[PDB]
């Protein structure tokens, strides 16, 4: 088949080598996964020594984490924006490791609100009134400062981050090979990586 | 068909789990006793060390 043998290619000195044997099975190749976006489609392959291996095609959801707040929530995956190796994977939306994606960012909002009793990126004060303010202000008096002052001096979500929630889409980086674990996990961009990739996206495309 | 045999087999099959739990409890307890004892000699050596520091710090 396709193969990952060393012996088919020439040595330091630039001289050829003549073939030493037929292609063995332990030099086996197999074709790319090319995970797209859509409703789940996970296949499995049998690899050397039993050992199922889950190839992923058409993924949709990812277990992304928020390092500063130690949160992590199963989140929908919205799109791919920047690929650091080849660019025609963002034109065809293939989802591989160290890609850069937009996710939905809603469960992080819910956690932040319910934990710090504060509002994140909002538009007005009309929508917050009919519901969900019954959670921000409570019956409590004991507790409502006994713990919520421990949640004060700490709710300082960075400006670069705060500007994102106003659209509801967050930049994230994959940290798992979907084509070998079936899952597409990762983390959400913080600190200086954020500035880096903001610059890079604004620079190349558009 | 459920003859007396198959019931005996199930009885033994759960009896073994019972025995394993017994063994785990016994072994954990005994080793914990012995290890705690070792800690005692450790600390007694540490204290004879800081007690000996009070001598060779002299003069």
């Amino acid at each position: 088949g396709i193969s990952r043998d060393n012996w088919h290619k020439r040595r330091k000195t630039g001289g050829k080598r003549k073939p030493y044997h037929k292609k063995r099975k332990y030099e086996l190749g197999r074709p790319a996964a090319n995970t797209k976006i859509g409703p789940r489609r996970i296949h499995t392959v049998g690899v050397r020594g039993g050992n199922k291996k889950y190839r992923a095609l058409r993924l949709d959801v990812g277990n992304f984490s928020w390092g500063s707040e130690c949160c992590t929530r199963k989140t929908r995956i919205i799109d791919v924006v920047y690929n650091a190796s080849n660019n025609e994977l963002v034109r065809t939306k293939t989802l591989v490791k160290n890609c850069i994606v937009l996710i939905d960012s809603t469960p992080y909002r819910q956690w932040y609100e319910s934990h710090y009793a504060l509002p994140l990126g909002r538009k007005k004060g009309a929508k917050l009134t009919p519901e969900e303010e019954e959670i921000l202000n409570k019956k409590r008096s004991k507790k409502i400062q006994k713990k919520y002052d421990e949640r004060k001096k700490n709710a300082k979500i960075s400006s670069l981050l705060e500007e994102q929630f106003q659209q509801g889409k967050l930049l994230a980086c994959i940290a798992s090979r979907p084509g070998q674990c079936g899952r597409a996990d990762g983390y959400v961009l913080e600190g200086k990586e954020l500035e880096f990739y903001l610059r890079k996206i604004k620079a190349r495309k558009g | 068909l459920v003859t007396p045999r198959v019931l005996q087999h199930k009885r033994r099959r759960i009896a073994l789990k019972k025995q394993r739990t017994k063994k785990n409890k016994e072994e954990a307890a005994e080793y914990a006793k012995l290890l705690a004892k070792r800690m005692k000699e450790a600390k007694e050596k540490r204290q004879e060390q800081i007690a000996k520091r009070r001598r060779l710090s002299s003069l």
């Binding site: 500063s68 200086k192 880096f196 | -």
Partner: protein, 158 residues
């Protein structure tokens, strides 16, 4: 030094995090980045430059992810044109036993030179150790540079 990202992807040391807490330092402060480094063993003192420096190399034996194990060798430098890696030479004497006489031979080796050592010159001696295959033809990382034989680097007021 502060600008080190030149590739199409962000360069950071793994096993290292950037917290986002306690914003009060005043008019300046910590660069906001600690350093990861480790020891090699066998008696090799990690260069202070590796600690204080600010660079990224997944293959540098003092900061990155490689283990030194097996043979230890040494050789004199003969070329440094490829980036982050150099070419060294080893001379030895084979023994023809019909005659009772030796014959001179040499062998070239590619090794990988972290940016920790910065002041190497053709002619320097270098002691290298064995790693996992880091490229097609590279199996050895530089562990310790030296110019300890004559015709030394600098004149005789050192």
């Amino acid at each position: 030094m502060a600008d080190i990202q030149t590739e199409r992807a962000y360069q950071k040391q793994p096993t290292i995090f950037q917290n986002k807490k306690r914003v009060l330092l005043g008019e300046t402060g910590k660069e906001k980045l600690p350093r990861y480094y480790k020891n090699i063993g066998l008696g090799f003192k990690t260069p202070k430059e590796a600690i204080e420096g600010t660079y990224i190399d997944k293959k540098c034996p003092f900061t990155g992810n490689v283990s030194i194990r097996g043979r230890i060798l040494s050789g004199v430098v003969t070329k440094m044109k490829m980036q982050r890696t150099i070419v060294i030479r080893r001379d030895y004497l084979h023994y023809i036993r019909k005659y009772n006489r030796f014959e001179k031979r040499h062998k070239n080796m590619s090794v990988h030179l972290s940016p920790c050592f910065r002041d190497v010159q053709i002619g320097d001696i270098v002691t290298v150790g064995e790693c996992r295959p880091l490229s097609k033809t590279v199996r050895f990382n530089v562990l310790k540079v030296t110019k300890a034989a004559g015709t030394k680097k600098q004149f005789q007021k050192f």
